[PDB]
Design a protein around this ligand. Sequence first.
Ligand SMILES: *C(N)c1c[nH]c2nc(N)[nH]c(=O)c12
Ligand SMILES: *[C@@H](N)c1c[nH]c2nc(N)[nH]c(=O)c12
Lengths: 259, 261
Amino acid sequence: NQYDPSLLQPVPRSLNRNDLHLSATLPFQGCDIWTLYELSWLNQKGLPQVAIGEVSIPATSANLIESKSFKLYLNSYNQTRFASWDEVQTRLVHDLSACAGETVTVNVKSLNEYTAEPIVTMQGECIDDQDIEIANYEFDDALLQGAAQGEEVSEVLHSHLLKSNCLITNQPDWGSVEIAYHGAKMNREALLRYLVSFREHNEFHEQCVERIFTDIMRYCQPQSLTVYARYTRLGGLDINPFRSSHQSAPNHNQRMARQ
Amino acid sequence: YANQYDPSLLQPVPRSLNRNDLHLSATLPFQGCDIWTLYELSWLNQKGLPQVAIGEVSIPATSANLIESKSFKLYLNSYNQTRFASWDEVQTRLVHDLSACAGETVTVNVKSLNEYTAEPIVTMQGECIDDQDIEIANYEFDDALLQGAAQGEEVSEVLHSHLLKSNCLITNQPDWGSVEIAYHGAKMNREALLRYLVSFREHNEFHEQCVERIFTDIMRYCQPQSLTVYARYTRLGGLDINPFRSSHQSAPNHNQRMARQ
Ligand SMILES: *C(N)c1c[nH]c2nc(N)[nH]c(=O)c12
Ligand SMILES: *[C@@H](N)c1c[nH]c2nc(N)[nH]c(=O)c12
C-alpha cells in the first residue's frame, strides 16, 4: 500500500491526433488542467494530510495520463509518510512529468485556500436555451457545414450540454465548454446540435476538446479560436482541456457548479 | 441503446442492519437526515434537447432504508436518455421514487446551474483539531481511544476535522470526509478524538453508518448532555452524502459544498 509511480499509465496523444489528421506541427497550443480533489498522504509522524492538487500538463507532451491510473497512483500516497508538503509536490512533479513526457506544473494547496471561493459560470452567451428538436444522437461533424456565415465578429459562446461516453468505461462524461473566436459569426443552432451530437460518442476529454477545435477550424475557419472545457470529476480527479490558436494557458481556473 | 428510466435500479438497505451492530433499539438516540447532492442530473426535454441540473435530497434518518449509492447513480443515469415534459415532472418522479425506496417521504430540489453562480465553498464551524503534533502508526479502528476522553470542565464547543477517511463497503474505494462535532458536556481531549477519527482510515463503512457510530461512541464514552455529529463526504460516482445526527437538532442550515466536494 505504499507510494508507487509504476501505477501511472501514459496514453499517447498521437492516437487521436492522427485520427483527426493533424500533423506533428499542431494547429493549437494549450494544456490540460487537472484538479485532484482527494490528494492525501501521511506526514513524517504518520498524521494524515489532505490537500487539493492543481496540475497543468502541456498539450505538447507526448502523452496524456489515463485518469483511473492517476487516481490509483494518488491512492498510493494515502498510507505513505512524506517529510513535508514540499516533498509531495516534488514527487508529483517528477512522476507526472516523466509519464506525460514534458515538465508538468503542480501546486499542492491546503483546503483553507478554497474557503469562501465562489463557483463560477462561463463567459459570454449561453447557447443552450433553444427551442429545437433533436432527432438522433449520432455524432455528426457535418452539423457545422456552413455554420459560419455571418459578419466578422469576436465573441465568446458556451454550453453546459456537452456529454460523451468515456472510452474505456462507458460511463458518462459531463462538461461545459467555452468557445472564444474571431471570425465569421457562427450559427448558434448548428453549434449546439454539433455539441449535442457527442452525447453517445466515445471520447477522452482531451481528445474531445481537440476534435471540437479542429472541426470548428475546418468548417468555420475563424481567424483565432480558443476552446476550453471544464468536465466533472471521475474518481476524484477532473480534467479541463484548453486549446487555443494563440494562448498557452487560460487566464482563469475556477470551478463550475457541477465540478 | 442506453438504458432509460428504470426505478428498479434503486437498492434499499435497511438502516437497522448496522444499527443492530451498534446495540441500538428501535427507539433511536438521535434524530437527523442524510443530505445528498446530485451533481450529474441530466435528462432530455420532450423535443430531445438535453437538460442539466443539480439535485439536493434530504432523506430522514428515521426512514426504514437508506439508498445504496451506486444504485442511486445508475438510477440517475437512466434519466440521461429519457424524455420528460418538464422539470416539475423530473422533480416529482425523484420524490416519488426515492421516497418509495427509503420508506419515508424525502425532499428533493432540482436546481438550474445558474442558481449556483457565486455560491461559496465553505469550511465547517468551530475549531479545527487537525494540526496536532502527535504520532500515529496504528490505523486499526479502536473506539476505546475515547475511554476517559471527556474529563474537562463543562463546556459548549464545536470541533471539526478534515481527516476522516474510511473504505467504502461495497465498492471498496476510499471515502473522504470532514466531520463537525458540536456538544455540551465535559471538555473532550482533542488528541483522543483525533486518534479515534483517524482509526476509521482502513475500516469498511457507509457514510451514514460511520456518523452514527461516531455519535454513539461519543455518547457512551463522553456522555455529553447534547451532541451533534455531521459529516460531509466527497462524491462517489457524481453523488455525495452528508449525514447529520443529533440529540437535539434536526438538520444543517444549508447544503453548501466543502473544498474537496
Ligand atoms: C474517460 N472519459 C476517461 C477514462 N480515462 C481517462 N483519462 C483521461 N486522461 N481522460 C479521460 O477523459 C478519461
Ligand atoms: C461506500 N461508502 C458506499 C457504497 N455504497 C454506499 N451507499 C451509501 N448509502 N452510503 C455509502 O457510504 C456507500
